[PDB]
Amino acid sequence: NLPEHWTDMNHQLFCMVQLEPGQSEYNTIKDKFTRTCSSYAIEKIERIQNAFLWQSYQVKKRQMDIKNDHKNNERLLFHGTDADSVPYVNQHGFNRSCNAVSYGKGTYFAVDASYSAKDTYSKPDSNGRKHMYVVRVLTGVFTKGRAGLVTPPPKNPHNPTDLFDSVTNNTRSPKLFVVFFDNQAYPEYLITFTA
Amino acid sequence: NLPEHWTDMNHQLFCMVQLEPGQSEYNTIKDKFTRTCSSYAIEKIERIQNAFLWQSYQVKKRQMDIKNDHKNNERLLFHGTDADSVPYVNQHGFNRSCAGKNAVSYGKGTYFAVDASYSAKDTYSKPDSNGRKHMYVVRVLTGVFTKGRAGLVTPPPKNPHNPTDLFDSVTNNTRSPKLFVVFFDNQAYPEYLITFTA
Ligand SMILES: Clc1ccc2c(c1)sc1nncn12
């Protein structure tokens, strides 16, 4: 059930597709970035077409939509990474086993591109190029995180196995989300950009 | 896509089903266990019916069956654990972030034993306040494997010049595997819980 906006993959299961500047898809993703990163130069935006990651992610989305009994479980967030991690993320997605972990030992996603644009996350390579993903994240029902969490807290210490889906720095005005399970995040676009 | 021999769960997502001695399903698990644990006695065997864990696992199996060249990707292995972990495993499966350091480490993952005798050690199946020990029987996607190393946080690459094309699991010994380590969620389905005592 590979999405409409994807382009033909000649019966293959992984492709990185460079977007055409000035077309609708590129414009939409560029505007999400330039909201907080207008001072950075975009070199390119690639659509990540990973059939296996998409399938595993869509299964978790369907499960979370059933469990939470509504469909506002997904957010579009940013993740900055070093050039050496890009091949792994494109192929395997986000791995909590692989920077600070103040809100728990999971994968960190930013509301604002400006946060992911810090050199500590999007480490400039030899040539000065920085890399940031636009990520579909199943944030679901979230609570405030804390150091040392290995999973989100229970929604009620009466039923200790019924968990929040993610944690955040601030529930009223979140700027980051942490997820603690594989396939709760789909890397959708990779932005290559410079300071 | 739930298996047709599961009990009706009436739109519920999770059920533990107590098996009856004399049924082939109970007896094959008992035989697999007593092959190496004939000194212990089984209190009961429960089939774990977890709709969500089963779906995510079955998706990973289909992917590994596609990726690998007609391999038998799945093994039935043992996992001993403490009473305090059983409700989390029943609901959420095996979380590498919760895993103990194994006395012989082949990587930082979840460990599964070929032999019940290994899982039956008090170090893994810690006896509870009533002297009950707990062991899962687990469908594990071992796929294509190599000898692991204590440093691993994922399985190693098959080819050092293609670092993202990974082995599916690692083992203690490729000629005579006695344990397997997996490093991803939904790579193992807890199928049965054995409750046993001395
Ligand atoms: Cl504390 C923390 C750690 C990692 C991290 C953030 C915040 S925001 C962000 N964007 N990409 C990575 N990250």
Residue numbers in the entry:
A (entry chain A): 481 to 578, 582 to 678
B (entry chain B): 481 to 678
The article reads:
The human diphtheria toxin-like ARTD family contains PARP and tankyrase (TNKS) enzymes that can catalyze both mono-ADP-ribosylation (MAR, mono-ARTs) as well as generate elongated and branched chains of poly-ADP-ribose (PAR, poly-ARTs). The PARPs and TNKSs form a family of structurally and functionally diverse enzymes, which are involved in the regulation of various key biological and pathological processes such as DNA repair, cell differentiation, gene transcription, and signal transduction pathways. PARPs and TNKSs use nicotinamide adenine dinucleotide, NAD+, to transfer an ADP-ribose (ADPr) unit onto target proteins or nucleic acids with the release of nicotinamide. Here, we report our contribution in identifying a set of compounds based on a new nicotinamide mimicking chemotype,triazolo[3,4-b]benzothiazole (TBT), able to inhibit different PARP family enzymes with submicromolar activity depending on the substitution pattern around the central core. The binding mode of the TBT scaffold was studied through the synthesis of analogues and their complex crystal structures with PARP2, TNKS2, PARP14, and PARP15.
When C-7 methyl found in 1 was extended to a larger alkyl (5 and 6), no improvements in inhibition potency were observed, while the C-7 chlorine derivative 7 maintained a micromolar activity only against PARP2 and PARP15. The minor modifications of the C-6 substituent did not result in significant structural changes as observed from the PARP15 crystal structures in complex with 6, 7, and 8, which showed highly similar binding modes to 1.
